[PDB]
Amino acid sequence: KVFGRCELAAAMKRHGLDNYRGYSLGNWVCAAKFESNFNTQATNRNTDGSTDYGILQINSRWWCNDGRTPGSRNLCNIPCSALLSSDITASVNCAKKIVSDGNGMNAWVAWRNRCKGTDVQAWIRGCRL
Ligand SMILES: [Cl-]
Ligand SMILES: [Cl-]
Ligand SMILES: [Cl-]
Ligand SMILES: [Cl-]
Ligand SMILES: [Cl-]
Ligand SMILES: [Cl-]
Ligand code: NA
Incomplete structure (x- = not known):
């Protein structure tokens, strides 16, 4: 599924990401x-x-099992x-497990390089939430 911007914001809000570990939606x-x-x-x-999977590009080295990343963990089971x-x-x-691990949202390279320090509230502008 390809979400729309506001559709995803709503789904994330409902699943408790808004301000989770202090990171605004x-x-x-x-x-x-x-x-x-x-x-x-x-x-x-x-x-x-390793491979990254899904909307948040979660990596099989640590977080999930894909049966083809030897010596990896599956911390999300x-x-x-x-x-x-x-x-x-x-x-x-x-994602909640990852962001709790110590490095916050720096775990997500695209977040660190394209979101951190920017006006992120823009991403939920206009949305009904
Ligand atoms: Cl939408
Ligand atoms: Cl967009
Ligand atoms: Cl959903
Ligand atoms: Cl499994
Ligand atoms: Cl943090
Ligand atoms: Cl925000
Ligand atoms: Na794994």
């Missing part, structure tokens, strides 16, 4: 834009052999394929 929408273009089906291979669902529940729940 715009930060999460901005991160999803630039990680996946709001597409739950997005996948990208990394150099190390989910198949990576669960992160590609039109239902963002699994992604949001695993």
Whole structure:
């Protein structure tokens, strides 16, 4: 599923991301834009052999099991394929674990390079929430 901007903001708000670990909802929408273009089906291979999955590009090195990243962990206790669902529940729940790990939203390279320090409230402007 390819979400619209406000549609995703609403889904994220309902699943408790707004101000989760102090990150306002715009930060999460901005991160999803630039990680996946709001597409739950997005996948990208990394150099190390791990793959990033879903709307928040969650990596199989640590967070999910894809059966092809040897020596990796599955800290969210989910198949990576669960992160590609039109239902963002699994992604949001695993994102909460990531953002709690110590590095905040710096875990998301697109967030650090394209969202951090910018006017992220723009991403939820005009939305009904
Ligand atoms: Cl929308
Ligand atoms: Cl947009
Ligand atoms: Cl915001
Ligand atoms: Cl699994
Ligand atoms: Cl959803
Ligand atoms: Cl933080
Ligand atoms: Na893994």
